Amino acid sequence: SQISLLLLKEIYTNGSTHIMLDILSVLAVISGICVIISKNPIVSVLHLIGLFAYVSFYLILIGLNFVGLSYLIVYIGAVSILFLFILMLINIRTSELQSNTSNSIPLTILVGIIISSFLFKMLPYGVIISNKNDLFFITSKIWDGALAENNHISSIGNIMYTNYNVWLILASFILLLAMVGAIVITIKPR
Amino acid sequence: TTPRFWSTPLKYCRWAARERPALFFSVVIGALGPVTLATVPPLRRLIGDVDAAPIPLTYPIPPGPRKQLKGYDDDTED
Amino acid sequence: NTPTQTYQFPSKTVKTDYPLIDNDPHFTRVIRYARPSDYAHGLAAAAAGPAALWLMERISPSQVGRGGFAKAMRLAGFIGLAGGFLYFYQRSILRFYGMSENAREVEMDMREMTDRVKAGLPLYGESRLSPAMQGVAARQSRYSALFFGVMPWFNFVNHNQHGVDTAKYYQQAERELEAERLAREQA
Amino acid sequence: MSAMSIYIIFVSIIAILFLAIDLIFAPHNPYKEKLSAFECGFHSFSQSRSPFNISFFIYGLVFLLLDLEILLLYPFAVSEYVNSAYGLAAALIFIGIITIGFVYELGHDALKVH
Amino acid sequence: MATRKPAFNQHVLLDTTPLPDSIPKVKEIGASSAPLLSASFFIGARCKDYNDDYMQCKNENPGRGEFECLKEGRRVTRCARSVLKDINTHCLEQFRAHWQCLDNNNQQLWQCRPAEWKLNKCVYENLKLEKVIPDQPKNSTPVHLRQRQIFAHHAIPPWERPFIPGQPE
Amino acid sequence: RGLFRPRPLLAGAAVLMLYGWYKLVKGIREQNELAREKMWARIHLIPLLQAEEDRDHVRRYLADQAREKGLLGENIKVYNSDRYVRPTFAVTPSKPAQE
Amino acid sequence: MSYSQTINSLVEVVLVLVPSLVGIAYVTVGERKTMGSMQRRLGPNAVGIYGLLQAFADALKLLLKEYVGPTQANLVLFFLGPVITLIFSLLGYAVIPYGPGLAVNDLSTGILYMLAVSSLATYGILLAGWSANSKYAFLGSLRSTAQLISYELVLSSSILLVIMLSGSLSLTVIVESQRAIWYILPLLPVFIIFFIGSVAETNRAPFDLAEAESELVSGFMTEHAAVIFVFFFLAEYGSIVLMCILTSILFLGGYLLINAPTVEGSFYGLSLGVKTSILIFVFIWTRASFPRIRFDQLMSFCWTVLLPILFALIVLVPCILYSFNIFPVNISLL
Amino acid sequence: PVPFETLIPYGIIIAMFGVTGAGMAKVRHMFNGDKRHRWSVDQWDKQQMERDRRLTGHLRGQTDNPIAPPGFEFNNPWKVXXXXX
Amino acid sequence: MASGYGLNGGPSRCFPFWQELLACYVTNSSEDNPDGKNKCIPVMEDYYECLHHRKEAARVRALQAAYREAEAKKLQENPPTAGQIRNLGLLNKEEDTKKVHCA
Amino acid sequence: NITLILFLIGILGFVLNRKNIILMLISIEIMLLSITFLILLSSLNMDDIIGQTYAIYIIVVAGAESAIGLGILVAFYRLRGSIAIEYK
């Protein structure tokens, strides 16, 4: 008769595989746990920078290249400084000796189930998608909206300093208070 | 030894240039921008330098009523 | 000629006791339409700050070292001057907003604009900024003198979004042009 | 497959190939004093896992905030044609408030370890 | 289908269902990206009114103009096949030299100005079609009518002149 | 040794930095003009390209409306409005091409 | 396209990595032969003809040299740090244009990509030094952290001044923009500052504090030996070359010139390599000309001299750009 | 005098850059149908290359024919994905 | 969504749906007639539908299971090859394009 | 779905922490990561550049909070001499 709907494999110009997102998902969850269960503080700050890395690679792979590279840039320095403070304020050897009890498991199961079940319907269909007849997203092309495509960083720049400049002024005052306050409480007297 | 700025502003500027050049000339370079902003655009227009028109970043939709065209209709195909 | 449309943007109506002239008046208009009391009050307000710090010093000396009070007066002088100008600006712009008695401002606005309309000049001037950036600027600064105590802001853009129908200006200029032609005939 | 992904593959297998060769083809004779910490010849107190004084921690605190500030300027450098004068003004106000905090760091001599 | 750029596409879906006999049929444009850019100024020199009419139609039917402006679209396609055939009956060596140059130069007009000047003159003397770019600065010479290109990887021969219509050689 | 005198090196630096800023004015002014030409060339093509794209969208929409009234008997209304919405999801066959 | 996509990417990566790894071998040989000439010596001239096999005698010796795992060391971190440093140092060569778009990834955010991979490689040095549980390795690792606080803002702030002129963040577009003029002419102070910060970024003299041998014994890499040591040198010299390529990309017009495509591609590659090789010389010239700075003096220099000047330029430069109507279009063009 | 043996490693470094630039250019020119490759590509260029494959079968293929070949109106690819919406 | 500023520098996909809902509210609701805002119920559902796609995912789901079960029951004679789908619309492949259309 | 898993890790790593106050400051960081990551994925599904802008301002305040936290820890450690949470 007549099919009329033809599925085909894209030879070039095809995208990434969405298997890789599930790999980064487990690794991010795996590394997130190892941040709190690790006896050594340096090993858990290393799992911390790893955790930020799989989330950044998750963002890069779904086309969020700026915020994904910007997340990584900001936190590599942040984890380095956090490393720098663990070596100044924590006895590494006594912390590794310091342990953890198993009395938190009953609370973990209860708190985990209740919050996750309650916090699930708080999330929309777009996120809960891809949780034997599944759906397929379909995309096509436009010419009027493609005249001068901007990069995401340019799109944020188009509005970050005019339409939403108030968020920048407030953000610059949080940073100023942090610059003045963090120094005021830690400065050596003179 | 070091001059006080409000006691003598011109003396302080000489000392800051010679003895604290990196900080003093940071303020000069940074202040030169607002001086550039306030003075160059008037002189640029005085000499006839014209800021260019913005390049179109969306289809330029003409204003007014449609032009009621007659051409390239279906009967013109063959 | 008649622009065939005088309200092009959706504006916010505020309940006020006097006619609204401009919801976003240009910086120069606020200074030009300032009454001489506005310079009297804003100068008194600027002097209040350092004079308050002087009086506190006379009655209750801080016991500060040799150069501290002079340093503190320089801060009190600036802060008073900064708040004095913000007070001077607010007095003039409230009249543009219709939030203060404005008969004098209403009449100079109805003359200055009808002078620009009979001259063919744009009512609020020409912007070097794009028409969308003009809108972001109108949106940012309209009624912004009501937040002067917290964050200040001034209108330095010649946009055309001021919250008022411009038909009254075109109506008067044509009637003024109508009277001018008849008077010129008897010559 | 993309060049970028293949590039990551190779650099990893070069890190393995060098590491594997040494782990297979080099002698390995670990004994007590070979496996000891270097201290220029004499054993000393092991103190590298005890709290240590960093005299430049105030520089790390400031670096975090300034790193955030120059990141909030990168969108401006890639959006200047649209931002124009109105957007330049806000970006100058943002830089001006941040510079005052830096002037506080310089004047208070926070960055002046002695 | 969505205008979002895909990040994990591995498959293409095609429909072999044709548009119904009700909608008139327009043969589609057959030119590729390089020939279309080489003749774009000629499109707009002849087809501007129809190009502008189809866009004002869609703006007059917001959210529905795809279905309700199908005739204006058929008209723009016909106007654009007219110039292509015209640029093919005449000036075909010049047209090919220009867009064949453009494909080897990242489709950058400033990298093929001598072939553009030769074609623009041949289009002008057989179609009365001129290249016009609006709002170019009056202080300086138009960029497409400039002897030296600063971003061109190869310098323009001194003996290759820009085409300005009217004035003789 | 005047190769290392601070003044002539300050002079030659100010000259080079002023000359290169002159060349930068001319370069960016030329590029902003090249950008204007690339955008007007694109704008003439937008109405013939978008017209072909719209014919494809109307054709695929009409087909799916016909396919549903056969498979599902009647058409289901996703949106209350009459406006065309580009599809986020499409019916696909259970197998790709055999190759 | 014409042939297989995977085979294309396979050959494209080999044409970058393998020639770059050969280049890393000879920057070490060239450094030793160039420092010697300025020291009235020769340098390597016996391992191979004119000493052209000396980098491979060194490389093969260490991969056949025994490795030691210290008992006080955190062993999994003792190996992870050098592997992180090597992988992410080499990752920066994936955005380098050897011609317009001739890169393994023509990314639109390539400059920020490089800032992210250079910062990761530094964290491997911090981790490896701390993991030894030795005191000189511990003192060196803290120096590396102080140095990144010193040079990361310097580089990123300096780069942002280049972006304010190019408007792109794409490495090919910044080279294409310099067809007007090389950025070392209008941004002469920024080129000096960026070069100074790049020497500090590389842990190269006069900013060789983490690995100082006159003060520490080998610094962070004292307990490290064999192939773990090979990784830290490969990371250092690939980081040097990469910073000389980037400085040539951002200020010296990159590949711009001072069967048919092969001649053009060769000339682009030669031009970039010639300019990169000059900057590689200036690194070796700087190492043989100056003493070492103290690490507090470097932190003071970057924070009270360089950064105040850079933020002043960040204010000044867009003010000149707007004043002359010279803001670059941020669309795709070049 | 000139220590030419000091400048030999620098010549090798320059040459291997030339090797890289020449080889990347040749392989891309082959992959792109003996044509210079495209760079700095945006959504419009990627949509234009996919339109070229629709008319010629090669993403870099060019035809000047004013009339499209039959089946062009049914060959418009609609991208199918599983998760990234 | 509701901002009007999308990822590419162009406007957001659900901005027309949001502007229509706000326009409906201001042009129907008032203190004189509180229940005029019931006109906004379908308009507000369209905005959520543009955002989450639950109603369209349910339509395609029902249509796709219906479509596939008819394909299995449908008589099959010869399946087009992948290469034949690639040949549709080419310069000199008239034979393959015809086979794709069963003509 | 991963956003929820990460948020639960940070919430328990903050509440059920028996190690040190630096780990509690890390768990706050993890929670802000998960909240930011939910806003980023939603922004992509609704074509909104505002949610990327929102995510960016969460990152800047997240670092400002970590600076005030590290600064307050230094003050506390200078006097207490231990930043180890202790259970008898």
UniProtKB/TrEMBL annotation, chain C:
Which Pfam families is this protein grouped with? NADH-u_ox-rdase, NADH_u_ox_C
Domain named NADH-ubiquinone oxidoreductase 21kDa subunit N-terminal is located at 16-101
* Residue intervals passing through the bilayer: 39-56, 68-89
UniProt keyword Cytoplasm, yes or no:
no
Q: Which UniProt keywords apply?
A: Membrane, Transmembrane, Transmembrane helix, Ubiquinone
Which InterPro entries does this chain map to?
Answer: NADH-Q_oxidrdct_subunit, NADH-UbQ_OxRdtase_su21_C_fun, NADH-UbQ_OxRdtase_su21_N
Which stretches are annotated as coiled coil? none
Keyword Nucleus recorded:
no
The protein's name: NADH-ubiquinone oxidoreductase-like protein
Domain NADH-ubiquinone oxidoreductase 21kDa subunit C-terminal fungi: where? 110-181
Q: Which PANTHER family match?
A: NADH-UBIQUINONE OXIDOREDUCTASE 21KDA SUBUNIT N-TERMINAL DOMAIN-CONTAINING PROTEIN, OXIDOREDUCTASE 21 KDA SUBUNIT, PUTATIVE (AFU_ORTHOLOGUE AFUA_4G04750)-RELATED
TrEMBL record, chain E:
Residue stretches making up the CHCH domain: 91-124
Q: Which GO terms describe its biological process?
A: mitochondrial electron transport, NADH to ubiquinone
Q: Which keywords belong to this entry? A: Disulfide bond, Electron transport, Membrane, Mitochondrion, Mitochondrion inner membrane, Repeat, Respiratory chain, Transport
Q: List the disulfide bonds.
A: 47-79, 57-69, 101-112
User: What is this protein's name?
Assistant: NADH-ubiquinone oxidoreductase
Outline what the protein does: Accessory subunit of the mitochondrial membrane respiratory chain NADH dehydrogenase (Complex I), that is believed not to be involved in catalysis. Complex I functions in the transfer of electrons from NADH to the respiratory chain. The immediate electron acceptor for the enzyme is believed to be ubiquinone.
Q: Which InterPro entries match?
A: CHCH, NDUFA8
Its Gene Ontology cellular component terms are: mitochondrial inner membrane
Q: Which family does it belong to?
A: Belongs to the complex I NDUFA8 subunit family.
TrEMBL record, chain G:
Q: How does it sit in the membrane?
A: Multi-pass membrane protein
Catalytic activity, EC: 7.1.1.2
One GO MF term: NADH dehydrogenase activity
Its UniProt entry gives the catalysed reaction(s) as: a ubiquinone + NADH + 5 H(+)(in) = a ubiquinol + NAD(+) + 4 H(+)(out)
Q: Keyword Nucleus: yes or no?
A: no
Q: Does the keyword NAD apply?
A: yes
According to the record, the segments passing through the membrane are 7-27, 76-99, 111-132, 153-174, 180-200, 212-234, 240-258, 266-286, 298-324
Q: Tell where it localizes.
A: Membrane; Mitochondrion inner membrane
Instruction: Give any Pfam family that matches.
Output: NADHdh
GO term, biological process aspect, one: aerobic respiration
Keywords from the UniProt entry: Membrane, Mitochondrion, NAD, Transmembrane, Transmembrane helix, Ubiquinone
Choose one Gene Ontology CC annotation of this protein and give it. Answer: mitochondrial inner membrane
Similarity comment: family membership:
Belongs to the complex I subunit 1 family.
Name used for this protein in its record: NADH-ubiquinone oxidoreductase chain 1
Originating organism: Chaetomium thermophilum (strain DSM 1495 / CBS 144.50 / IMI 039719) (Thermochaetoides thermophila)
Source organism phylogeny: Eukaryota, Fungi, Dikarya, Ascomycota, Pezizomycotina
TrEMBL record, chain I:
Q: What does the subunit comment say?
A: Mammalian complex I is composed of 45 different subunits. This is a component of the iron-sulfur (IP) fragment of the enzyme.
Family of the protein in this entry: Belongs to the complex I NDUFS5 subunit family.
Which Cys residues form disulphide pairs?
14-50, 24-40
Give the taxonomic lineage as stored in the record.
Eukaryota, Fungi, Dikarya, Ascomycota, Pezizomycotina
Q: Which domain of life is it from?
A: Eukaryota
Q: Where in the cell is it found?
A: Mitochondrion inner membrane; Mitochondrion intermembrane space
The name on file for this protein is NADH dehydrogenase [ubiquinone] iron-sulfur protein 5
Function recorded in the entry:
Accessory subunit of the mitochondrial membrane respiratory chain NADH dehydrogenase (Complex I), that is believed not to be involved in catalysis. Complex I functions in the transfer of electrons from NADH to the respiratory chain. The immediate electron acceptor for the enzyme is believed to be ubiquinone.
